[PDB]
Amino acid sequence: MRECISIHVGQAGVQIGNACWELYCLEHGIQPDGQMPSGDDSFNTFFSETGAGKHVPRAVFVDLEPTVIDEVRTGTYRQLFHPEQLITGKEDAANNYARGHYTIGKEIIDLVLDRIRKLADQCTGLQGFLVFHSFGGGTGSGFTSLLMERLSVDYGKKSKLEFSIYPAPQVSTAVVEPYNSILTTHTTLEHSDCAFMVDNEAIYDICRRNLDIERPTYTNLNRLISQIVSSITASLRFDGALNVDLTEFQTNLVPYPRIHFPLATYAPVISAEKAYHEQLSVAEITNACFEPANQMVKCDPRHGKYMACCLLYRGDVVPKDVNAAIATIKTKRSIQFVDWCPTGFKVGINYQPPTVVPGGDLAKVQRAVCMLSNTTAIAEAWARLDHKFDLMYAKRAFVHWYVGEGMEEGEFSEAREDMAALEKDYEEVGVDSV
Amino acid sequence: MRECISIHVGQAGVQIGNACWELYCLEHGIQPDGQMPSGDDSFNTFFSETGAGKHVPRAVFVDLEPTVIDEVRTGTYRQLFHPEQLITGKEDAANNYARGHYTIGKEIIDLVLDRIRKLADQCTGLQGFLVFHSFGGGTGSGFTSLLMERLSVDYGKKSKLEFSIYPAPQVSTAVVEPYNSILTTHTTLEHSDCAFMVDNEAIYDICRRNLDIERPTYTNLNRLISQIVSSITASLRFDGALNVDLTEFQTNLVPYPRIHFPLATYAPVISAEKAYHEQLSVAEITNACFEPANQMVKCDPRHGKYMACCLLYRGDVVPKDVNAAIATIKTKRSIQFVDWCPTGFKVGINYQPPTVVPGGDLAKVQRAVCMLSNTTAIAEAWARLDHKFDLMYAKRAFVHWYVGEGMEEGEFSEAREDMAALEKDYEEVGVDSV
Amino acid sequence: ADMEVIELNKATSGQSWEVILKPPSFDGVPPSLEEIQKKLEAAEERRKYQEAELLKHLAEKREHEREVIQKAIEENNNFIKMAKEKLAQKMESNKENREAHLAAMLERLQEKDKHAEEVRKNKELKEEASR
Amino acid sequence: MREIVHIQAGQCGNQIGAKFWEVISDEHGIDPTGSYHGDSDLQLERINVYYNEATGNKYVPRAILVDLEPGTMDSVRSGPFGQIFRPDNFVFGQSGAGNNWAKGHYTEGAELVDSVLDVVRKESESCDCLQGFQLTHSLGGGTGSGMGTLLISKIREEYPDRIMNTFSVMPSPKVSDTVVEPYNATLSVHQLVENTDETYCIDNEALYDICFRTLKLTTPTYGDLNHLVSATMSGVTTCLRFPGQLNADLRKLAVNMVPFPRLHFFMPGFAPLTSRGSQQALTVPELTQQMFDSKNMMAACDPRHGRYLTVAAIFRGRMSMKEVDEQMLNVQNKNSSYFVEWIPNNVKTAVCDIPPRGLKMSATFIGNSTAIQELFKRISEQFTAMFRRKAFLHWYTGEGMDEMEFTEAESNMNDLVSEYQQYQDATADE
Amino acid sequence: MREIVHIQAGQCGNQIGAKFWEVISDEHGIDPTGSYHGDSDLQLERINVYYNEATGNKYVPRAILVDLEPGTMDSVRSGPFGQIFRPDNFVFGQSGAGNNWAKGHYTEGAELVDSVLDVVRKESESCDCLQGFQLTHSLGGGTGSGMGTLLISKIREEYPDRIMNTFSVMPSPKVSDTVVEPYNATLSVHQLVENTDETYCIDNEALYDICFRTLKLTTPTYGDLNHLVSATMSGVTTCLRFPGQLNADLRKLAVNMVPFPRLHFFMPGFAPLTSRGSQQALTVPELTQQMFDSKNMMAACDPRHGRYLTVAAIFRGRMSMKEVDEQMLNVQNKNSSYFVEWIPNNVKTAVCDIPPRGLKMSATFIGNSTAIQELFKRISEQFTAMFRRKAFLHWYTGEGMDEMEFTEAESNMNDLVSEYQQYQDATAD
Ligand SMILES: Nc1nc2c(ncn2[C@@H]2O[C@H](COP(=O)(O)OP(=O)(O)OP(=O)(O)O)[C@@H](O)[C@H]2O)c(=O)[nH]1
Ligand SMILES: Nc1nc2c(ncn2[C@@H]2O[C@H](COP(=O)(O)OP(=O)(O)OP(=O)(O)O)[C@@H](O)[C@H]2O)c(=O)[nH]1
Ligand SMILES: C=C1COc2cc3c(cc21)-c1c(cc(OC)c(OC)c1OC)CC[C@@H]3NC(C)=O
Ligand SMILES: C=C1COc2cc3c(cc21)-c1c(cc(OC)c(OC)c1OC)CC[C@@H]3NC(C)=O
Ligand SMILES: Nc1nc2c(ncn2[C@@H]2O[C@H](COP(=O)(O)OP(=O)(O)O)[C@@H](O)[C@H]2O)c(=O)[nH]1
Ligand SMILES: Nc1nc2c(ncn2[C@@H]2O[C@H](COP(=O)(O)OP(=O)(O)O)[C@@H](O)[C@H]2O)c(=O)[nH]1
Ligand SMILES: [Mg+2]
Ligand SMILES: [Mg+2]
Incomplete structure (x- = not known):
């Protein structure tokens, strides 16, 4: 029981999925062929077992074009997945949300749902779904929102969590990505229970500044993203001192259904090439969670209000040190919580130390932490996207490509109005009560 | 022959019963196994005889919980009683009169009446009953009043005498003891012919002051109480001349039926550890009867009126010395009797000297006296109890426990009104005309 | 100064008498089983009623508990239902739009085919006149 | 009135419950195997109150261990006296309550409650004269709070004649596991006021302040807080466990302490x-x-x-x-x-x-x-600060609950404080 | 989205089209026989986009050669790499279009289009995932402009779901083949605006000016102009032909370039x-x-x-x-x-x-x-100078065309100019 099924959609979702499952295998001692020489058994939430001792990911990879999933089919981890879990079409969505949701997506939705159902049948206590995708791609945006809508029909209120890639100009973006981002966000909003946005610019900057990589590749970006994803899922794949259930994540983070976008911040992220410098204390890594340099989304929480804060530690960490670190933070003024929230903190501690991919850029550390904070500052990310959307939409630039696929101009204004309401919702949650 | 059946109810009644029957055995030369190697057949008023020469007390022990009677069943005197005359339930009245009278008591009333009938069948001239119980306990209060009511139905003519333990905060009391005391007093009043109240505070103080016991135990208290009970029952167990039958108690001490609460006062009480003690004269022990420190109930007879006075001497006492002692009392103090009663004393001497329990705290004396006086001063004891009752009842504190057991709030005010009438009755006797 | 001893009784192990110091100052000296069973039965019925009322209150709690589970099921079912109908409506609206866009494209190219026939017809009426 | 059946629910309940059994077992001379190795006949005189006598003169706690998550109970089993407990008395789910009172009371806990009642019933049937029940739990979580109060109401229905005693741990922002603690606590005290005979209020705010201020522990842990709890629990139950001047009993305690x-x-x-x-x-x-x-x-x-x-x-x-x-x-x-x-x-x-x-x-x-009205006022203020904005309410309405149930729980707790104030102002003026 | 079907129509279309295939064949390591002789696995990775694989691991251009005059197509066959093309893909008439758009669009081109569509259909059916079409042609002549635009409209009708891309050579009096080029060009851009997804404007005016001014060739030939065209065509299609940092795709290019x-x-x-x-x-x-x-x-x-x-x-x-x-x-x-x-x-x-x-x-x-409105304004001015006087209009009316069709084509191109100016003056405000 307590199973979680991961769904990786489009290039970004698939490639991030590759990095995640590579890291999970290394963390659990699972070989690329699925064999695991042997316990905890908490790893069964993410891996089913075959009668021949093979550990197969509870995952589905979907893309409307075959090239990306074809590298998984012929790569190092080709034996890890059953062929039926890797689903591909013939032609992609051509960076068009309308083709991913309608024209092309409609051709493969039933097959994907059938495969998800097959994985759900293997669960005795399904927790929900983890959906990985880009905001910008036609598949990542259009197909994901169609899948989320269909998952709400087939699984009702069953939790659906997203790991969404927020677009950045420095990291291979298309001109229409702001349109696809707002369209998918509007469509998926009522169907997602919690979404972890990952700003490509933030990751790009962290790779350049903290890891000394002049021009980061998707492999550099994804390996860092996977370390953060691993920290948030480690609570489900291991049994440590303080374990955070998937339901416990959301209960403590999401005060209102629409306000479900926590800001992720990870520490320590340090170069494998760096000089000695002995290990960062629990207080040092915890204080780093409030430094903007370590954030997954570019925004300013110092000029925002916190609604919740979840600290997920891993490695050489004892509760007494965590409580001392939290006590100092509670006395700081630079971190303002909303007046309607008596204590925003929730701590998870997993004793398994951070695993590093051999030949990677990250240095191996004794202890690490990932903070998930629900701050009103995350609305800055919406504001930037909405502005880019407005610039183009005021002229109706590119909207004929979407209308050509059967979409209506009314859907653009409906999606934008929902984003305006969302930005207004973030303003209202921060205003002081009576 | 004039048989008397003793009924011991609840912990206090049972434990006092143990001390009385232990003392009776010592006084009559009866061994703990019932064997008696041998004024003459007078002890048969309290003991029946078996075909194997065993002397068995005409007594029944009742408690709604088994622990106290279980110590009798496995104790030194376990052979003295037939198992059928030791009756126990599974759970007690939890210091609740209503629980002992209405809910739990109803379970065993028929059984106890059947065992009392069995003892009555062995009587050729049953005088009546001696009932030992606490005012404060749920069983002592609730079960006793239920029993007294049924005994009046089954044995209309028989005298019923009580030995009641009046509560004291110094001696393991519950907060609701004033409620239980007034409730039992109200319901038992019309069914009792004479009641000897024993104030735990009086016995506790005599043990501290006269026996040098810093913190008296129930054994210390009960052994002293039994000496007083023995003094009053001596005339029923030996060929006496004053109080030869239990009807005579009412005739000699209680001229007014509702005012049936005589004050007992005993002397001398000397520590067994106090060496070279010159034996006290008849005048010294008689004078001690008028000292409040020697009373069984804390009150002031000096500021009251006497309606009867009985002097019960035991041991080395000659009439000439008693008459000389009484003559000097007249001249020293103003002991005032009610208008209708003659200022006088009914004096009886039982030649059997006071028996002491070997290994006890009391010193063996040549002569002792117990005075039984019906004084209006005993109404001070009612006043103290009624005040405590009023303080709690004004707020209805704890009365939900009683209502929960089926008793109505009307029964509280009815019982309190009867006590108010009783206090007024003592006042009517305390000032008279025409 | 003046006492009166009245020898009451004398026996083998006792002796009693009355001593009067002064005389008085007056001329004269001054439920059934059915009822008890009724009281005990009335208390038992009051206690029985109180317990029945408490168990009825607890029965109401159990009823609310199964109404909470039912409400949770009903809300989830209505979320599935609305999402199913809204999605069917969206896919139908999109099929109609894409069908219409392609139908209009067919019609504009069919008009061109008709115009090309008209041009070829116009060539015949100009020809056969010259040479 | 002899035997007491102990129940410990949720993380906090099982943690303080295990500490309680470790402490009293040491006092009664019982080792982690269940064997008596004491040198006083007073330790065994009333050991029947909390322990069942088993084959080979072993003493087994009359304790039932409950949780909707298997983790905590595995840690209890591996703890110092973990082996003493009756294996069949470990009743655990697999879903967890996610610090949600509604999940413990109406959803996940409702599925497990019959299983726990079966174990309680088996223990109760082996009692010569059952006194009642003693529950250890927190009010800030979901299992101890929600399922614990559901268990209490079910037990009251089946054993209306027995005493229901609880050791309830109150939440504090000073030592907090969830943002939603004031909701869970308010909903629980609403249940406790109606369905318990006696509740010992073990306040985490007070335990933290004692450790911080008095004991001068700058960063106190749950272990430090639980040391104060176990000492208190041992003291509060001394009269029940030992032969003394007082013959003890849970009903007699309630009659004398609850006006x-x-x-x-x-x-x-x-x-x-x-x-x-x-x-x-x-x-x-x-x-x-x-x-x-x-x-x-x-x-x-x-x-x-x-x-x-x-x-x-x-x-x-x-x-x-x-x-x-x-x-x-x-x-x-x-x-x-x-x-x-x-x-x-x-x-x-x-x-x-x-x-x-x-x-x-x-x-x-x-x-x-x-x-004690100060403790309820504190929870009430914290409750209102969140409820004013309907913060986190969708997690409860999602389980089928209505906002009306929140308003009623808050109102009953406010009535409880007015009642305490009424007797605080009452004088013996007549 | 894998295969692209290439079509080259008319003199210019076949001349620049042949140059395109010569250039990219050398880049992909393909010799005039169709055999691979390169030393990089990157040359074959995406060779399927433009080439069909044949018996003996040969690579045959997915190219269809069209012309109403047999002349140019015989020169292609004899040229360098002329033997690489699929013989059955040469579809040619015998009449010629006489630099008359009406002849290519309505008269002799209309007779030959079904024959060309049969070859396009055969190539399309052998595609695992056809991306679309790539047409090379001039707008100044009659076959490439007239028949080329007729082909595109007929292809749009049969393949509405595919991308239509063109490399359109714009006429210039500095190079010139006829005074009627502005008519043919205007009539063609009227078709391109409606029926194409992307058009690369290869201007003969710019090519001549580059050769004359920059390269200092006093008398430039079509060969000199075509060298600039082939280099541009090779560059513009690099992302489709080679494995790079970005995927590629004709539809993705259109979605990102055409607002x-x-x-x-x-x-x-x-x-x-x-x-x-x-x-x-x-x-x-x-x-x-x-x-x-x-x-x-x-x-x-x-x-x-x-x-x-x-x-x-x-x-x-x-x-x-x-x-x-x-x-x-x-x-x-x-x-x-x-x-x-x-x-x-x-x-x-x-x-x-x-x-x-x-x-x-x-x-x-x-x-x-x-x-780009400067290019359309230039053609428009040249068109008006002739159309005001109805010069050479009998060449078109003789084929059945009406003077109303000229007015509509001119109006559509004038609208295209106003549209470019509208977005040139638009601000973010
Ligand atoms: N972090 C990260 N971002 C990626 C990755 N691949 C693509 N992206 C980002 O995702 C956006 C483009 O979406 P894609 O995922 O490539 O598109 P898609 O979902 O496959 O959809 P199509 O348009 O149909 O191909 C851009 O912002 C990219 O930088 C990846 O592996 N890691
Ligand atoms: N003198 C004396 N008083 C006693 C004794 N035992 C109890 N008491 C007093 O009796 C009162 C309490 O009543 P209990 O007799 O113990 O109660 P009970 O009759 O057994 O009734 P339950 O409440 O059902 O247990 C207190 O005032 C005690 O101090 C005893 O042996 N001697
Ligand atoms: C506060 C009050 C007012 O009157 C009382 C009387 C009593 C108790 C409390 C109160 C009491 C009882 C049981 C206990 O543990 C099992 C206990 O220890 C916590 C208790 O406190 C000493 C119930 C009986 C007890 N009676 C005697 C004679 O001590
Ligand atoms: C002018 C813009 C604004 O946004 C764009 C995004 C892209 C392209 C052009 C633009 C583009 C595309 C296809 C191409 O050849 C097939 C190509 O080479 C000519 C392209 O230019 C580099 C389409 C996809 C491409 N996406 C990425 C991440 O580079
Ligand atoms: N004193 C004390 N409080 C605890 C302990 N563990 C958790 N708590 C408190 O209990 C509350 C959370 O409830 P918890 O029992 O852990 O969750 P449950 O398993 O859903 O019942 C918070 O107020 C915590 O601070 C513990 O060992 N001791
Ligand atoms: N750049 C270039 N332009 C050409 C070439 N051949 C002809 N043209 C131009 O194309 C136009 C004439 O069209 P053409 O293709 O020869 O006629 P068609 O046979 O009827 O398609 C004029 O603008 C010429 O200058 C060539 O090889 N290269
Ligand atoms: Mg892609
Ligand atoms: Mg008792």
């Missing part, structure tokens, strides 16, 4: 306040001084802010009964304004020869004070 | 400007400087006279991608007024390791600039 049915929330206290480590010889006057000391209370209330309706003081260790009686009288005359005059002799004292582990002398205080 | 359906006419540019057979080394900064240089544009428009709606820059050769990124940022900040602010991130850059033949480094520019 009004809803007012059954006790403020426990302990002296001396000790930390874990190499400690120091307290006197009777010093022990009695701590009765009124707010610093010694396990509920974050100042007793001098209200009046005691009823107070029980239990002294443990070899000491003068005369001295205890004289010091108790002294405290009552010099603090007369903090006792209600309309309940005569409302301060009862008991003395047990057996002292607790590591202390030569100690005193445990059990008070029914009107000052 | 308004009618404004799909691209202004290509190339650096360095190289002589027909000559050898002579430019830096990344020098390559990026030419993005805005009017002298490097294949359409006779000054980019600094309008604004870029969207721009794609493809760099080829071994170079620092970091240097390309920094130089591109520099150009954008110092030329910010030539990019529309209402289309964020509208300048995209790609880098391919494989350089073109004879150059160590090169840059190809693809711009959707509003300055």
